[PDB]
Design a protein around this ligand. Structure first.
Ligand SMILES: *OP(=O)(O)OP(=O)(O)OP(=O)(O)OC[C@H]1O[C@@H](n2cnc3c(=O)[nH]c(N)nc32)[C@H](O)[C@@H]1O
Ligand SMILES: *OP(=O)(O)OP(=O)(O)OP(=O)(O)OC[C@H]1O[C@@H](n2cnc3c(=O)[nH]c(N)nc32)[C@H](O)[C@@H]1O
Ligand SMILES: Nc1nc2c(ncn2[C@@H]2O[C@H](COP(=O)(O)OP(=O)(O)O)[C@@H](O)[C@H]2O)c(=O)[nH]1
Ligand SMILES: Nc1nc2c(ncn2[C@@H]2O[C@H](COP(=O)(O)OP(=O)(O)O)[C@@H](O)[C@H]2O)c(=O)[nH]1
Ligand SMILES: [Mg+2]
Ligand SMILES: [Mg+2]
Lengths: 428, 426, 428, 426
């Protein structure tokens, strides 16, 4: 019943920092590993120290060093903290090939070591970003190997969705297009969120006009914990990760369920207001709490999964579902009946001490696969096209051995993906 | 992971004098060589620029090169000239005289072998080089002449390392050497294809900034080279220190170069205003972005809104939100969409470091690659042609064996860069 | 039930220093011999002082003097400390013949004296190095006599395997080739380790980038103690040295089992990690803990012996064996069924105070005979050949009476040995 | 176990003056003769070079030989000239005048009998000799001339002892005697086959090192002979003191000689740099190996990368890891594989001593046998031929009876060593 977390790149690792901090908060784990009390994620020592079963990869020493100098440096095993010396430079060509390919063997052997520590490997999940060099480059490299060795294990990916308006990486389209090509075909499911959309959540629901990544990742951590800690904890409907895959992936392509999370409420907003299960789920179908800037009303739904924490009575859930099925404007694709996975954990929602979110007594996470995602690809299509037509920055990949045909090909694979969304949109 | 820096020419030597000063400031290293800081980070990544010698002495990984002992001596005589080891002073005797032919082609060529030997010794001293950086003037004899020669050999030895250089570009108004455009032309001919990237610094623009926004009436070159070092140091510290974004020089190079030949940069810097107004300034991300975008805060005498922007890098130092940075950069892209090139979606890229420059809460470095750069090349090329026809001072150069057809090709090559900027200006 | 240790050469003696230090640590033996408490190795005096039954030979006074001036100078009997005045000079021709042959008679008589002190001589073992003058020269000389007098006693040799990359002895190939010729035919079993491989162990498992020989020999001492102290101590399966020979040597040639040892873990690496018997044995089949730089995956196994310390339950061992037999990629030679010797001592693993290795509660030593050893010989073949073709340094042997034909012959004997490995590799 | 040293010629006598000084430094022995040290090791192996005379007086086991009392007197007049007993001063009266014929063939020959008698007296005083060492110049009259004669007789008496010598090899630029190549040629003719090994010291190279890396502007021969003694003392102390590796001189000789006739060595030494840089140096094994490999730190005016390396010995003093040493030597072998000879696998051998030289943490001695050595022989042989044809100063030599056919054979023999280096250069 075990799983492995993999943190690649800054985004992967810094999100991971929040994630493991939250898992410590879930059980009262001390920075040194001492836990007085979740062995699905952790491995126990004779001292009662538990080791989070995870791998941290950075090709630049700095971020891992940040871990190594922080409080959780005692928690993590030195072998889990893997670092190279040089970067990918925002570039798949080095991340996947030239540079990252050198260290990956080590990385894999640490993974395999942990796989041998697992007794019942259920699977794993990889945290990264769609635009970066290691964030997406190296990441797909890893999938190429992991899908061989662990072909039957859960291969869930979580990635930051490139913001349409702000991006620090000029060749991000190129990176992301190459990842599509290689991840679609290897991964089982990839989830993503938009930091821009999140900012809007922070300013509207948390009332914060100063979000940093350390805020943004707390919110992400919430979502992740709902599906990682609480799915291993007790509930009414205990849903596994393999079950998630078995209940969220409808086609052999990928699919890309997007996150939505409600409650996201400031402490003051929690006052004077009573949420019910149904009210929280109402919020879950509002564009306003959509974690990716993509309009839910534009597309049609294919999948939807609702996962519940704390004070949730199935009775209320059932009523809530009835209304979301019938009251809303949620259009859905023919193919699908509304079999929405309901996970119901008794495990209460948790809050980070010193965080922004209010203590809540119940909480709902929503995953959804909508046809509007093709518009996200359309965004990438043109951004890629523009660059590629001019061949701007192309020498930074070509010099590492990339082929122009390959890039065209990858775009075409994306186009095919868009076409399949088109297909799904056609009802039948 | 490490960088080697080589300074050359009177310009380059004096710029480096400020550069290294700043780097040691950043890490708390005393003018005499030992470390007396006070932050973990200060020693933690010191390796990129210093070798720790026995006794907790730090040796700057750089070579000081000239053909006149006196300049070298003046460098050595100040604080931080003592931190450099004697072995990093490589110099000859008798100038160059601001003559490319002497520097590159003949006499200075002789010295380069000893320089390179020391370079090799340092390349071995490093664990893993990231790259090399050189500081020099484009119209100078040793700055460009000898310096270029060195670059061609270093690149040859290390194709896989970053080769960049910062160079003083002849300002429209103050040329010193009559054939300064000639030397510059020759350096383009040699440098552009023998470098990964080059930065364009105009002293005239710098003198305008120092009075325009900084409202200063006494600067010297040391004050202007401080500004230069601010941009240079800005770039490498992030690479050195913990941040949020993507802090690798090579990755910067990758994001800023869309085409093998067009790698010229316009540095700019924020915040950068007089003390009076400092009581009336607010420190926000939009504040920095306002200063970064504004052409008057560029250190290059260009005008980015005249040309088109190919690539923009925004490097931030200090604690900022990701959101705010993302949004303001987007806004910039949006509002100045008329200057950006349509082929590159989201042409403004960012990098974020969490360490502020000593004494400031925040700061930002602007790096751009516009088409506007071509205007500098055009000015030089034109001036060159006139001189070319007359052979002004070319007897000095041809006297040392420089052939006019080589110069002819150099002229073409300048014109080629302009035409390629036009090819992507659209 | 007694045995004799023989330490020849610096390598032999300095390793011995660690070994006898460890035996003192095993029982609380004071430097003066006072033991308050293993008489298989020691001889008792009326003062309760015990003398380690061992002989120390050095043809250069210095190393023995190092012993004579150290703390254990009180432990060792002055007659055990034998020294000449001049060296072999890295050279078999002097070590075996010209110089060492003069003192050997004394040496033998001290050995015989101890043999007479033994009541039930089980056998003995010789510590040396394959490249040195006394380390290999003198060593084989000794075997020539010991195999006559003690023909039926255990003749186990332990030698440092010449590092393929670093060697301080230019004629080491020549020395080692001559030893092959003379040791193969006289000895029963020779074990060896590679200091280069060990460095990799020190830097990867102990996390030490500054190993000296005094570190390196502690690790060797661990391995040796497992088979020397703990085989005389109580266990479930008490395995003798003669039993070792009877369970490790399959052919009348020699054979050369290589050492592997797991656990080799730094104190911090021990934290947060729980080893089981099975996990330790998993480590034992990893190339990474192989004490000789030779790839376990290259060759095929012929013999394998696993010796257990401390908290080992046969139950777990059995399960571990099942998985190493079936899970691994360990190819093995037909001839052999998997009868791997399991020695199981209750005697716990011991750690040197101020050492690098973590306190462990259980430990496993592995001996193995793999066909990949022929590659080690191939290394020697060419190194020898190169020198011999040019006849570089040949005058340093010829002047002592060596014959060129002899050298050719010795190479040929090595070639024959390689051919026999070839033979074994052919399955049948 | 013991060694006898004989010094001859003005050179040899002045070198030995520094050598013995150092040895006594190593053991804490006062210039007057008694032991005032402070380490157990200091007395423990003192036997190799000293006889303890009654009263706790130590007598250096060496003979000082010359044909002019005045040089001997000047040696005697300084500290450590008092530690030598009068019986170790063997000298005549009237020079040699830098004439081989006088030294070897005629007049100096007369003195040798008295020298040898004292040698015999000392050979009896030793328990067991390891060998003998002689210090001299190759182009000198008593240095080489008389010295060679002595060597042939000592070898005769003790075939089983190590016979080596260190000698000053005529530098390309500074010859003193017009027939210095003649004397050298004759010494090759005699020495090479009457010695186990000889070391090649070039004063010119030494003067370059002292300014090149040591940055000194005042050395004298005493300062350069200090460097010489550093290498000599480096070798024998290990043999004397506890170490890790294999510390026997004969074993060194065995590992360094692949062929009966090619036993010439290029000494080098590390660390060996100026004080300024000492604040910028790091002390690691690779650091020493960098200094050891570098040809500029060789004391012989050769260039090992021009020739091929037959054998290399790396001797280390002080605490070092075995791993590090092994790895760095391997790396050297790997990276400089183009210079090593393919016939000898793993041609770089090591020796390790745990005692550092007084005042340093670590040190290393480089001993090499390359083919590059032949270049020195070639220079001499050529110069010789010219002189040979003219008989320059040969009336002095033939006047003392030296025959030209003997010289002819000497010339051949020089050429033979070169051809044999070519035979193994491949
Ligand atoms: O450095 P390299 O390019 O080799 O690998 P990365 O770590 O992928 O590169 P980087 O440039 O940092 O990727 C940046 C992208 O990811 C977003 N991002 C960075 N750090 C983040 C964080 O802590 N939390 C979130 N939610 N997103 C983070 C950037 O916005 C950018 O798109
Ligand atoms: O001195 P002589 O050549 O006559 O005999 P030895 O003592 O065999 O010679 P030596 O040159 O010291 O042999 C060196 C070989 O053995 C390795 N070695 C030396 N000391 C060692 C030690 O304490 N521990 C180990 N593990 N290995 C040691 C050297 O690496 C070399 O190969
Ligand atoms: N910013 C700046 N420019 C300098 C400095 N010194 C000389 N320059 C510029 O360099 C050009 C002259 O070249 P110079 O450096 O004398 O050449 P060299 O010394 O012969 O290599 C002129 O355009 C100057 O403005 C300096 O310290 N700072
Ligand atoms: N290193 C060194 N060389 C010396 C010394 N004295 C003379 N020489 C060299 O020896 C050669 C001259 O021979 P010399 O010693 O006078 O001969 P001799 O005295 O007649 O035996 C010249 O090449 C000198 O450079 C010295 O003290 N040190
Ligand atoms: Mg990064
Ligand atoms: Mg020895």
């Amino acid at each position: 019943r075990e799983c492995i977390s993999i943190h690649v790149g800054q985004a992967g690792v810094q999100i991971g920092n929040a994630c493991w901090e939250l898992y410590c908060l879930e059980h009262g784990i001390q920075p040194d590993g001492q836990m007085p009390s979740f062995n699905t994620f952790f491995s126990e020592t004779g001292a009662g120290k538990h080791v989070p079963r995870a791998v941290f990869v950075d090709l630049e020493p700095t971020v891992i060093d940040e871990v190594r100098t922080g409080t959780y440096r005692q928690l993590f095993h030195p072998e889990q903290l893997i670092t190279g010396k040089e970067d990918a430079a925002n570039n798949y060509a080095r991340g996947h090939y030239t540079i990252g390919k050198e260290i990956i063997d080590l990385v894999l052997d640490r993974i395999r070591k942990l796989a041998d520590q697992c007794t019942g490997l259920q699977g794993f999940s990889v945290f990264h970003s769609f635009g970066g060099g290691t964030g997406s480059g190296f990441t797909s490299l890893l999938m190429e190997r992991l899908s061989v060795d662990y072909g039957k294990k859960s291969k869930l990916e979580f990635s930051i969705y490139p913001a349409p308006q702000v991006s620090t990486a000029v060749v991000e389209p190129y990176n992301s297009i190459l990842t599509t090509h290689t991840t679609l075909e290897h991964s089982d499911c990839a989830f993503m969120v938009d930091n821009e959309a999140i900012y809007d959540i922070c300013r509207r629901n948390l009332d914060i006009e100063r979000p940093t990544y350390t805020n943004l990742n707390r919110l992400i951590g919430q979502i992740v914990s709902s599906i990682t800690a609480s799915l291993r904890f007790d509930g009414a409907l205990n849903v596994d990760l393999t079950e998630f895959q078995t209940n969220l992936v409808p086609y052999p392509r990928g699919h890309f369920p997007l996150a939505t999370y409600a409650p996201v409420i400031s402490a003051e907003k929690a006052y004077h207001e009573q949420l019910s299960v149904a009210e929280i789920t109402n919020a879950c179908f509002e564009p306003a709490n959509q974690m990716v800037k993509c309009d839910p009303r534009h597309g049609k739904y294919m999948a939807c999964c609702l996962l519940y924490r704390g004070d949730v009575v199935p009775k209320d859930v059932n009523a809530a579902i009835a209304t979301i099925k019938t009251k809303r404007t949620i259009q859905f694709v023919d193919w699908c009946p509304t079999g929405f996975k309901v996970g119901i954990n008794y495990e209460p929602p948790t809050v980070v001490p010193g965080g922004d979110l209010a203590k809540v007594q119940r909480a709902v996470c929503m995953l959804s696969n909508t046809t509007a995602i093709a518009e996200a690809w359309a965004r990438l299509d043109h951004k890629f096209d523009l660059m590629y037509a001019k061949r701007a920055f192309v020498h930074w990949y070509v010099g590492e051995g990339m082929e122009e045909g390959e890039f065209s090909e990858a775009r075409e694979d994306m186009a095919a993906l868009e076409k399949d969304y088109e297909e799904v949109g056609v009802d039948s | 992971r490490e960088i080697v820096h080589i300074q050359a020419g009177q310009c380059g030597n004096q710029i480096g004098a400020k550069f290294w000063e700043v780097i040691s400031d950043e890490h708390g290293i005393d003018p005499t060589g030992s470390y007396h800081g006070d932050s973990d980070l200060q020693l933690e990544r010191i390796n990129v620029y210093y070798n720790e010698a026995a006794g907790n002495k730090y040796v700057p990984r750089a070579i000081l090169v000239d053909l006149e002992p006196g300049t070298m001596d003046s460098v050595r005589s100040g604080p931080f000239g003592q931190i450099f080891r004697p072995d990093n002073f490589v110099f000859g005797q008798s100038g160059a005289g601001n003559n490319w032919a002497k520097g590159h082609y003949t006499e200075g060529a002789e010295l380069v072998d000893s320089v390179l030997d020391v370079v090799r010794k340092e390349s071995e001293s490093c664990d893993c080089l990231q790259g090399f950086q050189l500081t020099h003037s484009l119209g100078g004899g040793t700055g460009s002449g000898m310096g270029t020669l060195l670059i061609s050999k270093i690149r040859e030895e290390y194709p896989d390392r970053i080769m960049n250089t910062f160079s003083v570009v002849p300002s429209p108004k103050v040329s010193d050497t009559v054939v300064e455009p000639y030397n510059a032309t020759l350096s383009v001919h040699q440098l552009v294809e023998n470098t990964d990237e080059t930065y364009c610094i105009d002293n005239e623009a710098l003198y305008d900034i120092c009075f325009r926004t900084l409202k200063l009436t006494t600067p010297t070159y040391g004050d202007l080279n401080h500004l230069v070092s601010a941009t240079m140091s800005g770039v490498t510290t992030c690479l050195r220190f913990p941040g949020q974004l993507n802090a690798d020089l090579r990755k910067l190079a990758v994001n800023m170069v869309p085409f093998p030949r067009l790698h010229f940069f316009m540095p700019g810097f924020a915040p950068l205003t007089s003390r009076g107004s400092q009581q009336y300034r607010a420190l926000t991300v939009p504040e920095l972005t306002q200063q970064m975008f504004d052409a008057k805060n560029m250190m290059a005498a260009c005008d980015p809104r005249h040309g088109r922007y190919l690539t923009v890098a925004a490097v931030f130092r200090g604690r900022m939100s990701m959101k705010e940075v993302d949004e303001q950069m987007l806004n910039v892209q949006n509002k100045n969409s008329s200057y950006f090139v349509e082929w590159i979606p989201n042409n403004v890229k960012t990098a974020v470091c969490d360490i502020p420059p000593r004494g400031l809460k925040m700061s930002a470095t602007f790096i751009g690659n516009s088409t506007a750069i071509q205007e500098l090349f055009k000015r030089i090329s034109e001036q060159f042609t006139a001189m070319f026809r007359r052979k002004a001072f070319l007897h000095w150069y041809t006297g040392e064996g420089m052939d006019e057809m080589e110069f002819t090709e150099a002229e073409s090559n300048m014109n080629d860069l302009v035409s390629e900027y036009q090819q992507y200006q659209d």
